[model samples]
Target chain A: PKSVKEIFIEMKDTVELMVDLAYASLLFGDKEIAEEVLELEERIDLLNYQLMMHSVLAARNVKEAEQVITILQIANAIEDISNAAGDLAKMVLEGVELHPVIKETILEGEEIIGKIQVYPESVIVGKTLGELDLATNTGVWIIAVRRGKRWIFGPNENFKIRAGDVLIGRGTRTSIDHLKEIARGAIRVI
Target chain B: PKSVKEIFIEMKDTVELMVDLAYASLLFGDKEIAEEVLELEERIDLLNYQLMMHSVLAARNVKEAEQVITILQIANAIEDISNAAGDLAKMVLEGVELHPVIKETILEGEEIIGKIQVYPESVIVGKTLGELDLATNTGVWIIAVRRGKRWIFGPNENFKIRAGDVLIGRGTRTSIDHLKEIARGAIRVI
Candidate 1:
């Protein structure tokens, strides 16, 4: 058996490569490379399976489970990263057309996520909440609105946003992240 | 470090259990179980990551690597299984229904993949060659037949299938095993 630390280091590189390969496959349509990258992902999956077994056994031996759970958490994070890449691959293959703006938003969000900065905060100053809806031209479900120490969750669509009210909308990850970043940034720094 | 036999044995068991857990989550809306399964998946992902890192170190130690590829392959397979579970979980949570018939077809087809006394042969006979579109149907499209002896690999949905033609299909282990059992029962004992 090999050291877990060593495996982790390679796993990171493998994931990074898989993500790059996904992008490459999308750009050039070299499906073989995409398939190969998917295969790489499978390998990561297999190793994860092995580690899980070992960890479970380790926990069974001494009965200390905190470490085992911690190990599991770390694994889930890595798996999430893997899933994100696979999702990208599926999006490319399934030909689910994203609105041009949505694509841009994703790229921009990816850029932002790559580099963590100060929280973005901003309030949409407009005539009505409908204006922001029309402006973005994106499908959004407003989950909550914070106003004057009162939290209204699941606001109706017809609810108009008064001036100085903060609106929280839930949509695609890209939009939500972008909105969250901007909203926070506007309140704090911007 | 665990012995290779112990590791492999435990891994095999873990794989079976994880798959079962994922199946349960998908079949029954046990969100808690699904979450637990996801965590296990993630743990495996981390373990794979660790193994890959160690592999790279081992590669450096040896001028060339022979077993290194296997290590990666194992890791990838584990991740694929995890992702498959994750996909199932998401579908359940999002209320994305997989048509039972179609799902059954997939299960049935996989089962057929394993049961042939000879090389498992499958032929998808459609009412019309041109109109045979699995894209709109729930039928598992693992292979297609245009005419007698003119075969193509699936999951090619655009390709047409003619009536009265055999569709030889291949699948992974459980798929083949389960489908074979179905095929045995499908035929009348002569």
Candidate 2:
């Protein structure tokens, strides 16, 4: 059997991002992003299923098999987390409005989760995330983006910030506002 | 009725930290930290129950009641995440060993999770976390500490380091090693 390490890493990274996007959709009340979470669930489930099958075949010795059992425990946790993430977005599918009060409660924290739409006039419209340096300039990290029917999770610095991209990020209120302003064309980074 | 916002925030914060500590225990194979995760679950569940009861009375109008449904969806996600976190630590309680390969795979990432034991000879032994400046000086954030039977999760800068305090931290491998070296009195900063 092939090394499950690669499969394990993908499950960990994907589920971690799923949690962020799952909460992002809830707080922003964006059904599109929420739908994306539901979509990702299928992928995670496949990974979980794939991991479990490999573990069964990969165990060669008693000690290694014991370790493999530990591996399945982690796989099981990841599966449960993805299911919970699906539950988060499932409300959006069921057409529940995210109470502004709930969102307000989350924003009250020192850090925040928020969504932004990149308008055509925005200074960040045509540039790549690398050029904008949101982390250095606005102190926000874009966790994912929605471009129409498609979604991009954990887009890197080189990923272009095209118009119409619905970006979800995590940052402080002040920093998130700073990013929002640039997205709204209120402030000029360049 | 008192605002359930406090309860909601506590649940959110506790579950997020629970995920972090859950993974921390797995990577370090520290059953002590795993036990703490189990204990925190009871606190989060209690908060969930309290929030549910308050929602019953907090709803005075139809629209407000509708909004309460959304609130519960979020609460449910938090509860499930906590449950999954418990499952992650559950394996530790069940007597499964975390395979070194599993730990090795995670440390391959840019950010790493690790544990350190501060000794009496260590330079950071007597100093508070504020003075040691782990984030600034060592580039690592100490997430928790295991001092015998007790556990402190996400301690503040005001918290002091002491001998026998086994610290759990997250950072790059270089930084984690830097702190470990400092804890063992291998390197002197002050």
Candidate 3:
């Protein structure tokens, strides 16, 4: 049986993923993704309830109960966060119109979260992270790289860039703009 | 002295306003509006604390405590909603780039939330809500109307629109697009 601590960790991870996926669904107005978020939310509820039950059992003294209270507080916070994410998704599901300024703000914001697909003619097609020195030179960090059927998370220096791969990067506005160009096979301008 | 119910009502109103303004801030990238949301959050916290104190003191038995617990849950829920508003504002304050899909989703979604300024020469300038027949004709509802510094909320059919007024409407994408033009003095197409 998984320990309560291990259960808490799993729940925390689910909450994070739930928030991301839920927001992503709202961003894209994708019902499929929104449905997935709802599923995760249900799972989160179960996990949270289980954790609460375990916490009550684990607390035998005043100090332990105090600690358990803190844990419960954390759980509530996570649940709230997840609920907010669900609300965002629900907005899309309900067909709420988002303000244009919101659209523009996201479009022109200083730091961007986006995906860039590598092109066949791109110069970085066969280059590894060490060779490209992307982070050092352009200030962009590739948090995930998806190629064909698989995804590599936190790719390192030895990770090679290839055509048809989709790079999910987070960085400053300028760097992401530049990276998007590079991914599309454009030569560096600066 | 205010009752717990009064405090709860105030907090509820604040949460609604906070969410609206925080989203408006996101739409416009207005730091001032974001700051207002942060201030409201502090106020919410204070109200929540006061409500908690009142609930505990007002409780006389287990049944009363149980009812008080429900009130506390509501207070916490409102606070959580406000915190979510704060999180959205912080995205702008922290300079986080909203994902493109989020923007695209809003831009292309089936419904729109928008404000339209009634031009002086507009045909609908002197029309009443009943005369305009916005709901029947355009599938849009004017939720609020602002003239000078004063706002009229949930205007009924007899509410007359005027030049230099601003109309806040929510409706289907097509209707909002049409309404936007009408607000700017264009003849209605549909």
Candidate 4:
């Protein structure tokens, strides 16, 4: 008897974690982590199935059903992202060789759905996301940031990037290339 | 001073109409309908952009913002579907020849987005959607039904399909094939 909202919250968190681990495993060559991602992919599929069932059951009227359709589409989007992560993990599991730049981009958090680490010597270490002008300059959006052991979802522009903080971003291929440069302390004026 | 809800309503309507015309044009080779779909594509983009701006501007709290996120994602899905319709229309505008089967699938209302005729000879001519078991047996959901000159959106299960009616449905390629067979009076037990 769980609420669809509650179920969606879990599904959203799982997709983000799945993407982070899947790509990280590909970057670090951890087959175990890649396997775990596959497990989570199955979990996402189940969650999506349950979500659709419960969402339809929960709707009381036509107007409500129309609203629920959006939630269904969002669930589909999450599933797509999870499936993409699974594909990435599958490549690693099959022992396929990847380009060094591919690994570097993911390891540096400059790939689509990648994580970047802020080091003490990095120019962006003390800068806020707004100051970094991520979207305008690099065309990436900071989706999450892991500080110490805690994770912040959808960090505001004013959120500062401290040394050792792990940032997750989503962007285009070209944007990720630009972000890689910025992550390496290459200051390009926007 | 229009509300985001109002903007989304127009965007939603435009996307539905765009899909209807786009596929129908593909079926009939009407460049005029294809052109209208393109215009609607641009209109959907403009409405989506404005909807996002107003949703963010109107949100008063984090909870409100979270709800707005779903709307934004839904808008994005609509845009994706609209863009796909634009692609189909673009093919026609450029005089690219499509497979006859592709046109038949669409014209016969057996594609992902298609229109089907309820001929007087069909067994389902007088049956309700619920009785037809459209979703369960055919794996198709009727989006709208055109009766005479009027259109019905999200027709209820009890709403009957009369002869000469045009039904718009969204379903898998296989489901649509089966549905098309049903439309042509081929009775197969589900």
Candidate 5:
């Protein structure tokens, strides 16, 4: 019976803490701390499972539940990113020979996902909606758009998308891919 | 509390119930039935959670966990597909308008995912192992190769991939993109 926002904030904190723990463990070769991080992650996983369960039960509508599920999946992906860092730390602790490039790639992916959670508000603007191609795409869907001081519940397809127009959108686990497309206008798929 | 297969079977059953409930709610304007379907979905969801948790916990080792994760993901995806279907039924109930073409596209996607699941052993053979370049360009990784009666466990990049070698690959939700390119023989990404 927790508010979705509260659950989300905790999920975010767990993700950030896990990342920091993994980094500390790797940089310092602290196996005990790394194991602790793993244990924390297991608990976080349970919390995520509970959150998903609660969302399905408490959603006022199916669409709302779907949105919550998407958000939870994104959080799980961030957890996976942290888990990879933990894997690298484990490798170091066990003196396992592995390619450093793999670790680097994992770290790079972790950074990208983290940055996407902070998608900028600079792009939201305008009241006379007509240009929606700018806002909606494969990776994101505009659930609602706010014009000036008023918020639109759910706008139609042709609703003009404008700068400074507050929008509620959805993104997937690879939200970095979506944000990069929004920021750079183009990104290498690879 | 349910086996993975049992969870999925329950999930599908719940999904079927959801479809009926959606129609009953929508066609008859019965909100109660709609809410009931939502509740049933939550029950199936908890079963899914327990199935995944047990699978991960019961794994013998890291490799086993990895395999379990893969299977868990597949089950999650399947449940997602069913969820999507349930949503479509909800849309019909709510009188939400959708372009017929949009429905076609969704069906096509479902068909492709179904084919991939049903025919895991079906893959086009790349002439040479390095010819996996095409797959890589499609953001697909050749996870394994099936050559005649031999099953190679250790995947090597330098191995000269033969023309008749079936290339088993994995791609993120982009299997359709890769499979289309496979049918086209060579894909030149723009």
Candidate 6:
């Protein structure tokens, strides 16, 4: 019952990242990064189902139903945005073209977010971030980690970097490039 | 055609604010605040129509249409989210309830945002923030301005605020209460 709190929070975090990753994937034409958006939409559906289940089991009268309905509607809206984000990613997956100015307009703004999926072949996989000391090495910080169905926001250094872990980082153009290369098993500094 | 850049940027900003205001209205049950979300959706529809018109006039081959279609699809997703936001606010306008834990959980986080709307009768309507020294007086900073269908993200003090401008700010809980009172013609501080 109390766990309802956990679902809404993650639901929101998911929606926010979905928007970012969707746009990034669309602009850059990264099919693999775009796939992450599809995966997240699937998670939003599962969360939506969990919320609906809770709605049915909770004891309530006509008076309480309004309160419960509001919560469900909020979750429903979150899922809707996540679904739209998946559509944005699907555009990239279908190998869509982008207007030159859209990318130009976006880049004119400072600070960019990037999505990186760490593959099993990468050297950074087995090593913990504590030993890797990535922030000092590349100046980019890991904002979140996607390990399996669950995500870890503000992941600690103690967590072992595993295969197929999608790391979302924020940095400058050169920094993200450096970080992305490391993820791909190149630059060898990885 | 160059104006296309301006439309998409505002489109992005509009969707972001719509989501914020919608959830805030739902959480606090503010009917007037909820109205703003509905109003923004109206603006979003107008932007979508304008964008659609450009799609027809643009001279393009199959290559150009693909690029332009991607942009429109992105805008379409933006509108879809805006619609969902309106739904969240309609819940508040129609008079809805919230679980005690829903509000309880949201408040547990720090760095809260507040929506302060200025009415025609308010004394601060004509005053500029530079003269008012709002951030100094109340630790809140105006992140964005809603001055009609168009929004000004980084507004300067040179522009005189008119009636019906909704000022969105971020600050502590106590600061938000004081700021809200100022906008409402209470506190007598303005």
Among these predicted structures, which one has the highest DockQ?
2
TM-score of 3: 0.42
Q: Rate the local accuracy (lDDT) of all candidates.
A: 0.44, 0.79, 0.64, 0.65, 0.45, 0.71
Candidate 6 segments exceeding 4 Å error:
A108-190, B108-190
**Comparing 1 and 3 by lDDT, which wins?**
3
Superposed Cα deviation of residue A23, candidate 5 (Å): 7.5
Candidate 6, residues A1-190: lDDT per residue as tens digits? 5477677666776776777777677667778668888888888888778877777677478877766777787788888899899998998898766777567545533235666878777779898876764643444656567787776655666877887898876544555766777788875664
Could you give me the TM-score of model 2 versus the true structure? 0.77
TM-score, one value per model: 0.27, 0.77, 0.42, 0.36, 0.28, 0.66
User: True interface contacts reproduced by each model, as a fraction?
Assistant: 0.00, 0.48, 0.05, 0.00, 0.00, 0.45
For every candidate in turn, the CA RMSD to the true structure comes to 19.9, 5.2, 19.3, 23.0, 17.1, 9.4
Per-residue lDDT over A11-123 for candidate 5, one digit per residue giving the tens place of the 0 to 100 score: 54454445444544443444654565667667677777776777667658766655555445544544554455455445446644332322332234212112222223324
Residue A85 local lDDT, model 1: 63
Candidate achieving the largest TM-score: 2
lDDT for each residue of candidate 5 in B82-135, tens digit (9 for 90 to 100): 464355345544555332322232223211111121132234333344544433
What lDDT score is found at residue A49 in candidate 5? 74
* Candidate with more favorable, higher DockQ: 5 or 6: 6
Instruction: Summing lDDT over every window of 10 consecutive residues in candidate 3 chain A, give the lowest-scoring window.
Output: A99-108
Q: Which stretches of candidate 1 lie over 4 Å from their true place?
A: A27-30, A60-63, A96-98, A102-190, B1-190
Q: Give the range of the ten consecutive residues with the poorest summed lDDT in model 6 chain A.
A: A104-113
**Model 3 regions more than 4 Å off:** A1-40, A43-190, B109-111, B122-175, B185-190
Predicted model 6 interface RMSD:
7.3
Q: For candidate 6, what is the DockQ-based docking class?
A: incorrect
